Amino acid sequence: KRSRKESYSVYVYKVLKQVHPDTGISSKAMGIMNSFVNDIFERIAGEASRLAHYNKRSTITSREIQTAVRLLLPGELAKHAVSEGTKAVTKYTSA
Amino acid sequence: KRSRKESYSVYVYKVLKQVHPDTGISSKAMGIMNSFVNDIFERIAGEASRLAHYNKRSTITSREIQTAVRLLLPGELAKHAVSEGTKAVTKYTSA
Amino acid sequence: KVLRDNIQGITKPAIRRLARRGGVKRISGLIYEETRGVLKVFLENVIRDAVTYTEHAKRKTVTAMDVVYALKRQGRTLYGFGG
Amino acid sequence: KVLRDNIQGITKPAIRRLARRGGVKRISGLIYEETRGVLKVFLENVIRDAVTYTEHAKRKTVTAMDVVYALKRQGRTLYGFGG
Amino acid sequence: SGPPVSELITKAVAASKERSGVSLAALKKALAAAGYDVEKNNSRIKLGLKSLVSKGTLVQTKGTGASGSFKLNKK
Amino acid sequence: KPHRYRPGTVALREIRRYQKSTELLIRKLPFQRLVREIAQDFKTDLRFQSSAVMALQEASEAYLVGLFEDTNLAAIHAKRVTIMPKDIQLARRIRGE
Amino acid sequence: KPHRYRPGTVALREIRRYQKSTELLIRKLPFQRLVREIAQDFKTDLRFQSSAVMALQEASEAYLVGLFEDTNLAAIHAKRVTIMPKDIQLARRIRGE
Amino acid sequence: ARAKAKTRSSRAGLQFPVGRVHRLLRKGNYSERVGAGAPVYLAAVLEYLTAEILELAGNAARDNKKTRIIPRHLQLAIRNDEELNKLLGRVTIAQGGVLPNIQAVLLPK
Amino acid sequence: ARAKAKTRSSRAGLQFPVGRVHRLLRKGNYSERVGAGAPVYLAAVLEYLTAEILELAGNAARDNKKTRIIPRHLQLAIRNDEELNKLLGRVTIAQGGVLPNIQAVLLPK
DNA sequence: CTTAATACTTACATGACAGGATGTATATATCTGACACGTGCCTGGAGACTAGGGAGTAATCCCCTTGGCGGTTAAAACGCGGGGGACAGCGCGTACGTGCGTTTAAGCGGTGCTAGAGCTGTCTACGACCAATTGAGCGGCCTCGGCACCGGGATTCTCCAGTATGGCGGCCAGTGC
DNA sequence: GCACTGGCCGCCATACTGGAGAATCCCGGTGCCGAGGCCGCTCAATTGGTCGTAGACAGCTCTAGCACCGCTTAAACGCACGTACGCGCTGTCCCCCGCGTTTTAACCGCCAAGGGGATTACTCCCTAGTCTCCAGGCACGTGTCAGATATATACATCCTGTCATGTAAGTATTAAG
């Protein structure tokens, strides 16, 4: 009898096989990716909450998260992450 | 008129009058006291939220902010602030 | 309307006064332009942040609290205008 | 069960190996004791933080997850230990 | 009081007479070992070295002025 | 003869003078001009509170002045008393900028 | 006559070897002992997860290596190829520690 | 037939408001539930910290023969306490300046 | 009677879990309400960032002619990209090492 | 006859190049457990619907920001001087670096214990929600005295003109040849 | 008698010391505007009750840390010699501070105007909750090849020997006074 602990093993593995069908991982690198996804999610979510604090807003929408993305992410990665997020919310709205 | 803008005028002024009845403040220095109290409140509140998060606790109790103030404030500042916090909470349990 | 060079508006005596606050006895001649560079980098970083808050608020006026938050993100928190 | 002066357990060739990873071409012999002191001071910082988490959790066993919190709270974030 | 420094510098350069000239730090050590307050006579020994190189009694091997190595003349 | 103090002791006197002091060290309105011209490169016709330009000012000389005691330590560390640009990249890189 | 390299060439060889390599660089057991010794001072009868002491090992080596490249920057800034503890004090105090 | 409206700051004998700090913790989004002793403990901590920094500012003002404290006094007070300086190592005081502290080699012979 | 279940990540055409990230935001204590596009946008950002770093890691492992990535590859990828370096300057990777990096004066001649 | 100029010739420092040693790549065998894939599952994700509420958006107003003109002056700018700082060369002294043996204690493999980590059930304390209240705290106003601004004398801090000291030079007289 | 030479005295370069200038400290005077205290207001803390639920306590289990033990070498250590580096002195060059004069635009201050922040109101877009239901990743089992490890070649590099060369130094010659 065990209790489940949630992680991103299949998700990172799927994204890797999308970008590299022929490349594997170690378990250690997967632990690094789990720490990374949790850390970056933590940073974006904290800054989004702090922005919602600043504008006295109780709602988090994609505008605030996109604001945090331009705020924290340096350089061209900002324009990129806005690009895929905008395309993704475009399909999500059209679905 | 105008909507009320909440501030930390009266409490810091009364603390000054207890520690030094005779002296005064500038309003600019008083704004630095407002910023100080807000910043320390944000630090302690964020650490309390993290400790409630980490131990899967739904509550903010005196124990975890005690943990936080032991983390942040160095040395005898931490030990004394523990001392006034404990005597204050025991006085509050005495209503 | 348009401005092309105001970074030379931070004058050499002003930089000298800043170094005198820093305890600097002697300033090389090559100091001033790279101090202009580091200050335009710092101002660049803080106003990109503060502006990002500024049209995040749907407001066209830069407020002091925005500069406070921009420094608070950037690890260089400022006391005096909190609120 | 009693532990006395295990600071010299961080051996001198270990410090030399770290300096080789640190890119140090040549090391003074005076270096080692202050490196021990610096790493020591860092250890009371992180272990005090970790135990503050630990008997915050009312546990007698120190976990790696609490160490991850201690390093994150120090602004020295570590990856690969369940965080 | 005693005699002036210059002849003691001649004994300093004639003490070893190795392949290169005797150097500034070496002659300071030689005067210290023979017994002299080289601490308060740095300008004195600089002017002495410049005086002796100007008269040609000693010649300088590598350095310039009071620095480098000084060796005795040809004859 | 006209009187003249030797170099540096005047400079130490301004060190003491501005170091005990509290006021602004740079001109206000050229700073406002610089802030507006560098700001308009992101969003056009940005308007600034006077308090906002003020705040950005003392934040600016705060970061600059901290950089100069850091480079001061760099300068004495190299057995020098005049700061140099290489001291600046040293301080910037040790801070991890 | 046996082989002998000139100084530094071997040293650069450990630089390439260890900076290429990724393993834990200090001994495991005395580091475990030192963590136990320090932790005894703050709370009695502490037990440690082995993974926790490992996490201390990478954290400590990362902190130390970062200070050592900072020290190298300080030493080359002072025109030296040999570091002194004053370099480490400089790096710590510029870092704000 | 309600009893007299008394205050929790008077209940703890403290000056900082238990009610306002409790409200800020509720709406600062840190947990959905907050125990009752937490705002009391927090207000005590804030009052203690203000206690030293205000008395040190007043002492430095009295050294400067001012009965009104100035941000310069605040900077002088906050940088002269090593633990508080560690607490605010990253913090900028407006119009605060720096300590009078020059390196030994900067002075003449 | 009931529509067949369709996952929101597949609706967005993304691998990263819309539902799990949304649920984490509910129990990460960040806001009372979360807009619908916010977790989708966050999932897209995370998926892009992970894709980019995994692409760099796979390229580096291919340069090391290794089929599977190890944290040394992650270190090598994260340090030689300036935007990623500025993203993760303060982050330490276990068993990662550092870049092959020698100073100019340290070399012979 | 003498004695310094000058060419001539040789030993030593320096440098260019070959070559071995050795460490590090580089090519091939092998086994293995960590990675990767197949399986039960159940619970976290999803769908519908609805109560409700934050928030988007229009109106306005006033206020605070922006634009512009005159004086004035202190600060910015330019130039001379010069003294002070940087720094390169060299040289010494030493202080680690590297290379040998040696001790040892980490490292590894194997056994056994238990103390506590963690899961499960209970419930009981305990904290959120909400209607009504009131008084504590905040907007507004108005005075005054601590303090900014200003003026005048002392004191201390700076730098130079003038003195005391050490070293250099010159002269003389004693003495030996 | 004469020339050498040591000793002694006179003169010059270099390090103490008092004195003048002046920057700032220290003392009054003055007028003022921010602190601070009072007054009216309003909204947020309070109080009390309910109600649902979060973690504290108990208890059980099992597992991973701890303790112990025996080989087994890798590494720690120590030493010794060597060479390479830190730094100190000096000299040299030149670069930036101090100060004086000229200029300009910053500051104030004074007025005009309007952009937008900000506040209120309204109506609505959206989201959270809940019930039900199902499929996707998680726990877990298994097998299996990428890589760890081991063994044999081959170059890199790096230190050193070895020969050619520049250069310093010793030397005969000789020409002129």
Author numbering:
A (entry chain h), B (entry chain d): 30 to 124
C (entry chain f), D (entry chain b): 20 to 102
E (entry chain u): 35 to 109
F (entry chain e), G (entry chain a): 37 to 133
H (entry chain c), I (entry chain g): 10 to 118
Q: What wording appears in the published article?
A:
Here, we report cryo-EM structures of human H1-containing tetranucleosome arrays with four physiologically relevant NRLs. The structures show a zig-zag arrangement of nucleosomes, with nucleosomes 1 and 3 forming a stack.
The H1 loop L3 and the N-terminal part of helix α2 contact nucleosomal DNA near the dyad, helix α3 binds one linker DNA and loop L1 contacts the other linker DNA. H1 that is bound to nucleosome 1 always contacts entering linker DNA via its helix α3, whereas H1 on nucleosome 3 uses α3 to contact exiting linker DNA. In nucleosomes 2 and 4, the entering linker DNA is in contact with α3. We found low Δβ values at nucleosome 2 and Δβ values of less than 6° at nucleosome 4, where H1 was always observed. The distance between nucleosome 2 and the nucleosome stack increases with increasing NRL, which leads to increased mobility of nucleosome 2.
